[PDB]
Symmetry: D3
Subunit: 248 residues, 6 copies
């Protein structure tokens, strides 16, 4: 993507898309994709509970910091980000300095499994499309450690549905495309329970993210993976969900 | 209650309530309470997935069969109910014979922990305000046993929120009132994971059930327990939730 | 209570109680209650094993320090107490200064779940009627941490008997009265096993504590809860037990 | 031993032992040993709760049926025994026919791990000095299966104390002597918790069984193993205990 | 493949391969591939222990029965096969009738997770390249059920190495190619331990199977997936192993 | 033994043993025993993976340092040893100073359960015939702690085979002889899985160690325990194995 690395949710604004014959259509599409992505990040924020200006938020696998900047403009709190990409950290910070908020928002190169945050000092943290890259038990044990008792964890992610048995080929094609390891909803809920994380909200967002991918499949920038997403989301083997949980 | 033994959800129809000075007000209130209760049972049904006419549904702790009759009029399937009360079974069946559907809907005196249903033959089952009377691990292990792989379990129940530590006095007052043992959301999610039940939807309904109890606290039939419900729901120590899960 | 916050054990000295017609009867009763309470605390001490003058003992949920002062006068060791009540800490310490033993015995405001004691430095610790206020797994994990390998843990507490299924209303009435969360004997034994605590002695003391509550139910100071205790102890749904365990 | 295969408890009757110079001393000793053994079996019975005439009791590893005959003469119930020795079964039954109670008491060759008793039909069962011959998790899972909910399990056995780390040589010498596999108190309590068996009474009987072994070490029939028992019981590495538990 | 559906092990016979210029080379290659495959199946048999003529062997995910026919010609026992493919069952049986051994060897359409074999009646069973298609805990729980105590389980399979963290893209490409779900060596060993299966032999066969795939990558029949196998086997993210275990 | 405290593997060199009539035979035997012992230690090293000069290796229960000196002469790395015997530590170090390598190899008196090594700093560690002296879960949890992610653990040890049920008398005789507590292969594999140790190689070495013990049973130095080893290794109740695992 251009800013947010995650996917979006919500009905597409076809009116603003205009004529696919215009030259500026492919541009008007990128703007739309962004709008839908911002909307889902805004939705993930709605689930962090009431974070105050004095709280410290953590974003595991923060990408370019889009979610961190949004968290700060909304809550006023301090936000620490973490990623494996140096280029991405530098980017997020550069953007913060420019916004005059690098005194609250910072990204750093660090593996989300071995973070520098002290036990029980984080008020809320999240994984926005990044838990598909790490063992679930270990990332949740880490969030649980640095999370304050009563803290809030949120994760928006794609997971294969165990209701239909083993992972469908679609899920595997996506895994191969991103060199990730998509987990099952069973594994998500299991790991959370074994790590003192208790779900407060579990919501399947597949219907809200479908328009996003259908619109994306009609572009130039298409990478060939949008087919896997659309089919798996339709036959139900793959699903987009949001899980907000309390660190009990 | 009068028919449904569970509680309701949704905004109160104050217009239909009219003048609390009318003699018929206390009557118009009972009708409203019923409407809200039917609405929540209708909501629990929305989470059973697509049950077909050939499926067999189970209601653990079925009360007077209100949820069973509703399930059948909606899906056309067979519905087996279970309770400890003989008077309640007789009632549910009597109502079925009268509706001319006792060839699909039946209630029987049987403990939900030791049911007669064969392994993997039930398509969907639920606990509507009755899981607060039994050990969670054992009732979920039982549902999991008679539930078909891919089947759907739903539970609407009051649970104390572990986010606020131990059970508040309010929760204990309710327990004493009904001689029940209200569980924690942690225990609900934990038991489900240890019994091959994977939550597909988790939604806090406390805001939707609050109007129900506030309206109830203003009646003659009041039992004195409505205070415990309203306060605990407000300070957040007690919460009303719906959990729909897949038997994986 | 007046000094010890716990309950007592042993046959009542009716001779010393004299005529319930005397004015001084209600006084002679308080003295008796105290005697029975001291006797049970003395009994809990009998289960700490051979603690030496150089050992450090811990009392989780120490109340007014009665058990701590008794532990020190008997063993000569150092005793650290912990409670949530500032007024109770101040009281215990004041009493220690007066006894000229505040150089061995001290109480402090601290939650028994997050104690300041170093790993493996405590020789023996106990919960005298206070484990009913906290999650069992967490308090036992904490005792296990600061407990020396080979150390001794003791707990005297009321627990609902799982032999009779769910908690009886009596247990719930008590919970509501003290805003506590009485656990099941199953939960006690389970938590101990998951936290390297191995029971050396398990003894039901309900028969020895019954006289205590029957005598108490005949006083002025009665709070109305003595009925719940007596009935539940009689029908067997509630039980008073002592569990001495080794930190293996 | 002569009848009971287990060990005994209680103070030795030195008066009845008389002069060790008599020829009949070695005989008077066997009679004493028996008395102490009967006394411990009587003690194990005290922990079966109130078994009625219509109950079915099970003895896993029943030896010659001494405990079964005693259970029946006391309760009037039906008692099924199980052992690997055909010669021992035949003996127990022969003794029953003679007592005119083989219509209640029966022994059979069957492994205690794979019993023929139906799920939930046994009221109480026990292992008197025989759990040291089988995996603990498997024998307790079996008792739990055929045990009625609310049933009572009792075991009197020698176990190495984990408070002193690994098994002492003494314990190993005994294991080699009987070709058994003495377990740790930790393993006993652990297995019970993982198999729905909740200890109601745990009592160290080592002091009550010591006189038994000291008297035994002074006989002709001595096998050389009494040294291992006496030393290990004294240094505390080995211990004799009774555990009565409820099948919850 | 042509007969065996699994992969092979052992040094390639380049001498028998002759000139890649011959027309008959592509034929001489298929014969070689077969030889290597037969050799690995022969190797899996070496790990079934001493199965006698009266034993019943099971092959979960049997393909065309090549391993079953080989097991019978070697041991003389009865061999039951299971697969999801009707065409494959018919094939295996047809081959048995022709060999005059269909009175010992039979294949049937049945899911390896829900088999018809009775508890404890199978002497040895195996998964030859088929465990990558099912949840590991469930297939091993099933083998454990129908496996006699002391029985032997063997599995030859490809598994991603957890020593290198998450699944490499190579593993994902293979998963997508076969629509399977390759597990981690950690998951293999974990599931076995949770299902009473104790490994007696664990051997990495990646070096012995490498020649097999290198020779295969030089053919006409190539499917494009041989690259994924060779690279992942070389960088160590994917590995071919054999695990022989006892049902304890 | 004389240097290595462990046992050996490999065919006996009868030619070098010469005439058992020579006076120097009993000497030529000790030399042979040593050769076989060095060979097995060399074999354990083959399973540490590619340890580099900058790695730190740990030997839990190091005896006289024979395995440590061998590890260093082969890899060039730093090797820390641990034992309970002061005399053994002094010996290992003395030998290191003499070899001019005490700047890489060191032994110290420390219990392998509570080591001073920092979390994740050790590249590979092992237990050569010493895990039979400690609880398995605790020693493996310790290795896992100080072991780097991706590190390698190896253990060569005698374990009773669970395939034959409970420990045979032979195993018990050995336990009594060394005052150790021989574990079951089940316990070895179980503990490893619960402590993030995943077996890469599991190999029964009983056939390779048998010649070692048969040759030993024909000497003067015989202690009487060689009978237990030979018989148990033959009837299969006891077994010598090597387990190499990765810290995942
Ligand atoms: C890729 S999805 C968005 C982000 O996840 C991050 N990510 C993936 N695995 C990570 C890990 N193990 N630790 C920290 N960040 C990770 C990437 O660096 C990227 O910024
Ligand atoms: C009470 S809430 C509604 C229902 O739960 C039922 N119930 C409570 N515990 C039960 C149990 N253990 N088995 C079956 N029904 C139960 C009551 O009979 C009643 O019909
Ligand atoms: C109440 S019973 C006796 C004591 O338990 C203490 N208590 C209850 N919960 C506690 C906790 N979580 N931490 C420390 N003390 C506690 C009270 O302060 C009181 O002194
Ligand atoms: C020996 S102690 C007393 C008894 O335990 C029995 N015993 C030992 N192991 C047994 C098993 N696995 N199943 C049934 N009885 C057993 C012996 O047969 C003997 O009667
Ligand atoms: C494919 S690998 C070889 C075999 O595995 C079988 N297989 C895959 N999944 C199976 C399952 N769940 N139950 C039985 N056979 C299965 C296929 O039918 C095929 O014969
Ligand atoms: C005995 S086998 C070889 C070694 O194991 C050591 N050993 C046994 N138990 C130990 C423990 N708990 N901690 C450290 N070394 C131990 C002995 O000191 C000896 O050097």
């Amino acid at each position: 993507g251009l800013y947010h690395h995650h996917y979006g949710i919500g009905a597409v604004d076809h009116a603003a898309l205009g004529d696919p014959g215009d030259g500026g259509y492919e541009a008007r599409l990128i703007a739309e994709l962004h709008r839908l992505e911002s909307a889902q990040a805004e939705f993930l924020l709605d689930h962090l509970g009431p974070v105050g200006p004095g709280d410290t938020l953590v974003d595991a696998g923060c990408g370019r910091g889009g979610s961190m900047v949004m968290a700060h403009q909304r809550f006023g709190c301090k936000v620490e980000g973490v990623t494996l990409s140096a280029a991405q950290a530098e980017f997020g910070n550069r953007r913060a300095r420019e916004l005059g908020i690098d005194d609250h928002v910072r990204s750093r190169v660090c593996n989300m499994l071995d973070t520098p945050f002290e036990k029980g000092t984080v008020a809320a943290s999240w994984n926005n499309e990044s838990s598909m890259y790490v063992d679930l038990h270990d990332v949740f044990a880490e969030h649980s450690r640095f999370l304050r008792v009563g803290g809030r964890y949120v994760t928006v992610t794609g997971c294969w549905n165990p209701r239909y048995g083993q992972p469908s080929k679609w899920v595997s094609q996506i895994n191969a495309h991103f060199e990730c390891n998509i987990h099952s909803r069973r594994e998500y809920l299991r790991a959370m329970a074994d790590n003192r994380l208790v779900p407060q909200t579990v919501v399947d967002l597949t219907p809200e993210t479908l328009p996003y991918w259908e619109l994306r499949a009609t572009s130039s920038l298409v990478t060939g993976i949008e087919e896997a997403f659309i089919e798996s989301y339709r036959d139900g083997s793959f699903q987009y969900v949001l899980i907000a949980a309390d660190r009990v």
